[PDB]
Design a protein around this ligand. Structure first.
Ligand SMILES: O=C[C@H](O)[C@@H](O)[C@H](O)[C@H](O)COP(=O)(O)O
Ligand SMILES: O=C[C@H](O)[C@@H](O)[C@H](O)[C@H](O)COP(=O)(O)O
Ligand SMILES: O=C[C@H](O)[C@@H](O)[C@H](O)[C@H](O)COP(=O)(O)O
Ligand SMILES: O=P(O)(O)OC[C@H]1O[C@H](O)[C@H](O)[C@@H](O)[C@@H]1O
Ligand SMILES: O=P(O)(O)OC[C@H]1O[C@H](O)[C@H](O)[C@@H](O)[C@@H]1O
Ligand SMILES: O=P(O)(O)OC[C@H]1O[C@H](O)[C@H](O)[C@@H](O)[C@@H]1O
Ligand SMILES: N[C@@H](CCC(=O)O)C(=O)O
Ligand SMILES: N[C@@H](CCC(=O)O)C(=O)O
Ligand SMILES: N[C@@H](CCC(=O)O)C(=O)O
Lengths: 608, 608, 608
């Protein structure tokens, strides 16, 4: 379940154990480690149970040495026991293993008929004995492993050492992940980079098939053949940019105006022959998804707002039950899991602590599985989910989310077709969805071209300290987002409310210092809201209405129609986000606030 | 439940009984009284059941004496029984008591060790034995009482007499009301002046912490230190001919303060044999309920807030899926009904147009059936639902709802047991809920007893135009309701947020004109939030924390701990509603806003 | 200039050298390191020139040992030479130091008299002997250090080890940054976190006045009184590889903190043998400059402010007439040129239209010639002038100028020696100037170390809409620039005035909404201003005073002294600029305004 390896000048056992602690979120039923001093004395220590047991034993009888491998196990072959736990040995050959060697018994009898005593049930032990064999005939660890790897079928990863030669480790990625961590005169490796953070941030991710020879001072990478490939050491990931601001003053402004392009990119590879094509999920996929009867979405901030929009879509268009929840609230409560529930997480950054906690928790609760909708490749939410859909918006530098939100919405709309319930309705539905998606980039462009009007409109808000945003249905979460945006970058106390709840409280607040915005109401809703604002005429209440030019609404003295171009219904919520983004942007511009880095806010909330 | 005491020249039994009769609106399961003659002969009579039984018993066997005390009991510790009814005795010490001694176990032990025999199951008996013990070492009843008080935890509201010295009563106002009634050559005391109207109209209201020593011809009041305190004696005009708000300035005030009795009425006939009893729903329905797999709740405003708490309850305590939605949102969208779904509506008035439309719409979407939780008999939601549970709160006249909310909560919590889907126990869950509910009224009185404190706190808010209310889990909808209340009757732009989401937007708004309130956080949460408010120290950000005194939280200069009495966790959400109602009320008083009829709001919104 | 320290199981020499490598971007002229093995054998290497030389020298040595310290030097006291490099020793005491011990002569004489031999010209060496002396009396290294710190006056970030006991390091911060890196069973320290990145991301920043005792496994921090103080370790969730802001939140912030190094770059190659070396100007430079009888300076904005400082310098220290004028005023009027007049333009960008026009016009007016002080090579102003001096501050991205201003001041101060006319009567003028210039970089760092206090002070201006900045003589243009900065990035209406003119008008304006700031006044001036603010106590007039702590100024209730460390008089105006820059920056942070791109301002005004 977890692998860790170190080759250093200092004692590495403490580091190995700490690595395993940090791998506890996965696995596991047993654990163990094996280290080696300079004289070649290998000390091995294994327990059935928690890592804490192993650390306990390790404490009162310390392991000394600068070379070592450690492992946490989730048994697949052989009952959980100290006997079957890793590392496994073949005399001087020591091995840790993740995944499965599929052809175990063939090779095990092959080697058994060669003098090898299999003391365990695991498929792993075969690895050890085989490496032993191949080393029997000259060469050293590398050549040998290079021969042995092809003789193992299966998705797996393994780290291998010879205690007669502590200066080298060998690794093999063949269906299960491994990453190397670069230290100073020492080097590490693990099944996930989470394990190496205490000790390094320089990583070399192995490619599928790669084989690595690691020393204190060197790291050589090859493939199945043995031909020295080179791999680069990433760290991040979220670089900026300059520069890439182009004709725009601010990262956030740029990110607003690139939304058509970002959406095009989100659509790329996912539309064909007038249908939604999510085949990128896998050959299976279309079959895990078929079993889903309920959707649970978890997110924070703006991502929560996108989830909130998607609920309306899933329930009305696809006919699937869908719940959306603040991740903080999910992780801290005992919940009731619905039958056949898909867990979806929404996250720009993929690192938000609350949302990650929610996903991990979901794993113990009996969810069908998880899908991450995310904007940053190789992030934690992505690595830890069963399925992932990247938004492809490009890096987003402004602290307030803009393109990340509209691309999230795009992907969520794409899921609707691929998850319908509710068949027969039906092709009319996926049809309308795809037509809308095809229209979307241009509709956004239309909307961006209203910027001068929105920029003029912002003068009505730049001296305000309160605002109320109203919305109904698939537009309520758009009002939420518009309010959040005004909070974020202009510091105005803007609050969103469901349109039908105005009379139940907020109406008592409305006056000249608290403008009311409604997002895309139909005529019936508007009549109701006009009547409401008439109730507070004597205090100078103003209604602002972003609405379809086709609707024919007529401005009055206390109600200002801000007409917009027509849109396909199915994408209207995405469309109507843009003006609210532009409004917040232009208010901030007038006030002179720090748009890209608003006070007290962070791009990503990753620590607790 | 009800206390009456008397000290006169004439016989007082008839007066004490008439007092009890006049206190009957406070739910009770039993009653008793004790009187002493000039010679020191003490007579006590106690009966299970109605005051009528007690009076009748007293008639065959007339009680002589000018000194006496009297009590109706609402059982919290020890079943209703003659054995457990008050007054309780420790030889010459005779005591009546309202409320809950938090440390009765340890005290009962220490007193048993000193040789006292406990004949009842009540916490109350420890008071009598403890006073008897402190009196052992000589002194005045007063000094003994003063010694006893510090060793007591919780609400020890009490009236005490020593049958050897019938010339004095001792009273301690702790946890519920006590009013002194001044006669001519006689004095009286009761938990409400209604009890005393037959004999006087001059009253002195006792405050939390006051201790009174009373004789026929004098009244001396002091705190636990001994220091005299002055309290003014007001004369009562009126009788109760006013459209009675009685002693209260506003209907909303009355309705906040009658919450204990309202709740008692909500429980009538619904607890039997230590279990929840909803047999009123009929045998036919207890069957339907076994079939429910999912709960759906529709409501508007404050009713929506109570539904929102219940979500957390049903999911964690009953392990059933529960969803809660604004009625207008549900009616105007096409939804996906869950398998075997119960439709629940919450509504004070039963006529709210959105909620009613929601019920009607649901009639054709395939729910198992509908249940209405309501406060108005005969109303639309009650007639059109399959089942109905009335809150029995009495009429609510204030436009903002208070007792309707807490009675709604009381019903919802009772529904938990009868809709349980967990296994094992489940049994202890229903026991905890039942004990919680039996304690709830006393708990509310303890909160009401904090009103002066809350009234001082209101000064920090009276001139604000913004506020942010935070809560996590089952306290988050309590923050919703707190904020709504401040909006409603004080016109302050108060907004509620999930505690976990503060860093995701609202933190950017916080400064001196926008105080932050947290409802009932644990230490981990308080730490996160404390760090947050540190982030906006430079802008004069203030954090106000309502929390359990037992938590041992400590104030700093920008974080203010408003400690509260300890309460059972299952009813903490109800309990913590009260200080938020009191806050809004007192802010409104300072500003002089129209509490009972806030601008632009209506009792119910019955028109489309 | 740079400090690194390590205490580990493994050898730390390579780690030390790599740290220094990562500190190299900071101006240095030499480097050294010293490491101690477990047997207490101490190996020390020092070399003149780049870190590369040090690393080579290390190539020959088996530098074993787990404890050590290392340093890059920027000489202030004693020529750059291997003899003068750090670490400096006193037998078993080994010491690295950033900053300036200015009571170094008293201490060196006292220690010489006590039997110590000073083998170097540095101020640093007295620390090594002093600690040595203090350990001679006994106690632990920590106690000796506590006794020694108080005897030091000035700036010191120092790390200190005893080769006889290599398991402990001591560090003290006062006027120069230190930060601790926490590892796995090893610990580290550095003057700059960038040096610790290869081995850890967990830091504890030492604050002003702190003293730390570091072992492999412990960190204990405390103040000069031995009183343990606590600091929070925090994971560094920073992306160091993200873009050009490096570790900073804002370009302007980075440009403020970069000021010491920018200044070192301005000084590079312009001090030779204790004298200003402007030979870069050409062989026949002194030829033109000798003829100059009068200086005319033209500039806009902040550049005009530096010019304005220089006027005082030129006239008082070089005794040449100097005139400074807003460029647009000069270009549009018919002026009367002085005889043998040198035309100097100051400009960060070299492209400002008014300034450029000024120069061009001067071409036809009979000036001896033109000198351009500029920060961008190849700019119009540089190309079109006879002589040019570049400030070498590196690119400046912030719209408001910071390092451009202080580097300009540095160049202008160097011109003073090369343009002298006091005969004299001189010699010591140039010596003083060169001394101040040598100290400048660490003096600026000393100011930066006061940032926490300036941050705190900012709360006092965060909500103000007016301010008045006062200065006299060479501090008056500093007030000009402080006031400009506050206008620029916080949008507060701040205005500077000559101190002596306060009573001639602005005094009428003063009240609580308009704080008064004085920069670096002497006692006589201070008393005048104190009386002035008295006149307006009744309207809430506050006087904030930035002054030398050596002056012994005492705060009243409406006069607030903000003490600053002593500095060389001749560079006092550059010194006092920093706190006004930091003030404006922190006010903008609190208000959340666009620091890097303030509303309506441009980096340079190039169009007519
Ligand atoms: O008013 C506070 C309550 O005590 C509340 O905190 C609840 O009892 C626990 O938080 C349990 O939550 P879960 O059982 O859902 O985890
Ligand atoms: O943004 C506006 C949309 O057009 C929105 O109004 C939605 O498409 C309809 O409300 C349909 O939803 P239902 O099918 O659930 O009624
Ligand atoms: O009040 C305005 C004056 O007319 C003033 O503008 C001045 O007389 C001219 O501008 C000429 O000045 P110069 O001769 O210096 O260009
Ligand atoms: O979407 P995530 O990366 O999970 O972050 C959720 C939220 O985090 C922070 O608050 C950002 O400032 C927001 O803009 C974002 O919406
Ligand atoms: O509870 P209901 O009768 O369904 O009414 C819902 C809401 O309507 C109005 O706004 C009242 O002022 C509220 O106090 C109430 O909560
Ligand atoms: O120094 P210069 O390039 O000639 O520019 C003069 C002024 O121009 C602009 O106003 C910049 O914002 C200033 O910071 C600068 O001082
Ligand atoms: N199949 C191997 C490895 C399991 C794992 O990857 O944890 C075993 O059971 O030992
Ligand atoms: N707790 C006490 C008092 C009850 C009451 O306040 O009525 C009892 O159970 O007897
Ligand atoms: N003043 C000391 C230290 C200089 C520095 O901070 O680099 C010296 O001249 O060596």
């Amino acid at each position: 379940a977890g692998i860790v390896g170190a080759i250093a000048q200092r004692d590495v056992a403490e580091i190995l154990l700490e690595g395993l602690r940090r791998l506890e979120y996965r696995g596991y039923d047993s654990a163990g480690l094996a280290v080696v001093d300079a004289e070649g004395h290998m000390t091995r220590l294994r327990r059935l149970g928690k890592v804490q047991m192993l650390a306990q034993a390790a404490e009162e009888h310390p392991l000394h040495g600068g070379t070592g491998i450690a492992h946490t196990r989730w048994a697949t072959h052989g009952e959980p026991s100290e006997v079957n736990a890793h590392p496994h040995v073949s005399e001087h050959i020591v091995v840790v293993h993740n995944g499965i060697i599929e052809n175990h018994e063939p090779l095990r009898e092959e080697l058994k008929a060669r003098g090898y005593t299999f003391v365990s049930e695991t498929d792993t032990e075969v690895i050890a004995h085989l490496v032993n064999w191949e080393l029997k005939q000259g060469g050293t660890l590398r050549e040998a492993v290079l021969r042995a790897i092809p003789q193992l079928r299966g998705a797996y990863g393994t780290v291998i050492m010879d205690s007669r030669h502590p200066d080298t480790l060998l690794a093999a990625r063949s269906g299960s992940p491994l990453v190397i961590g670069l230290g100073m005169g020492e080097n590490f490796i693990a099944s996930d980079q989470l394990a190496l953070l205490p000790v390094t941030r320089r990583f070399i991710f192995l490619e599928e098939g790669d084989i690595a020879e690691i020393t204190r001072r060197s790291v050589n990478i090859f493939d199945k053949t043995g031909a020295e490939v080179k791999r680069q050491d990433i760290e991040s990931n979220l670089q900026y940019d300059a520069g890439d601001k182009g004709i725009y003053r601010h990262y956030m402004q740029k990110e607003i105006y690139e939304q058509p392009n970002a959406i095009k990119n989100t659509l790329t590879g996912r539309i064909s022959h007038g249908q939604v094509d999510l085949s990128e999920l896998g050959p299976n996929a279309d079959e895990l998804l078929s079993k889903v009867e309920h959707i649970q979405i978890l997110a924070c901030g703006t991502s929560y707002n996108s989830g909130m929009v998607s609920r309306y879509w899933f329930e009305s268009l696809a006919g699937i039950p869908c719940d959306v929840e603040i991740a903080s609230e999910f992780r801290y409560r005992k919940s009731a899991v619905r039958r056949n529930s898909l867990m979806i997480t929404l996250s720009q950054s993929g690192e938000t602590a609350d949302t990650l906690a929610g996903l991990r928790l979901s794993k113990e609760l009996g969810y069908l599985g998880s899908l991450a909708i995310c904007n940053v490749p190789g992030s934690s939410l992505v690595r830890e989910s069963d399925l992932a859909l990247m938004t492809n918006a490009g890096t987003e530098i402004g602290v307030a989310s803009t393109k990340a939100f509209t691309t999230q919405l795009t992907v969520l709309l794409m899921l609707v077709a691929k998850l319908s319930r509710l068949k027969g309705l039906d092709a009319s539905i996926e049809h309308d969805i795809v037509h809308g998606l095809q229209a979307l980039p241009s509709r956004i462009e239309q909307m961006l071209s209203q910027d001068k009007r929105i920029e003029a409109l912002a003068e009505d808000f730049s001296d305000k300290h309160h605002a109320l945003f109203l919305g109904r249905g698939d537009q309520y979460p758009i009002a939420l987002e518009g309010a959040l945006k005004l909070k974020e970058i202009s510091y105005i106390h803007a609050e969103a409310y469901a349109a039908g709840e105005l009379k139940h409280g907020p109406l008592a607040l409305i006056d000249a210092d608290m403008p009311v915005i409604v997002v895309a109401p139909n005529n019936e809703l508007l009549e109701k809201l006009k009547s409401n604002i008439e109730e507070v005429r004597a205090r100078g209440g103003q209604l602002y209405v972003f609405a379809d030019q086709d609707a024919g609404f007529v401005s009055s003295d206390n109600m200002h129609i801000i007409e917009m171009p027509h849109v396909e219904e199915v994408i209207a919520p995405i469309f109507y986000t843009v003006p609210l983004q532009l409004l917040a942007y232009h208010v901030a511009l007038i006030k002179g606030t720090d748009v890209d880095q608003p006070r007290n806010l962070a791009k990503s909330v990753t620590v607790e």
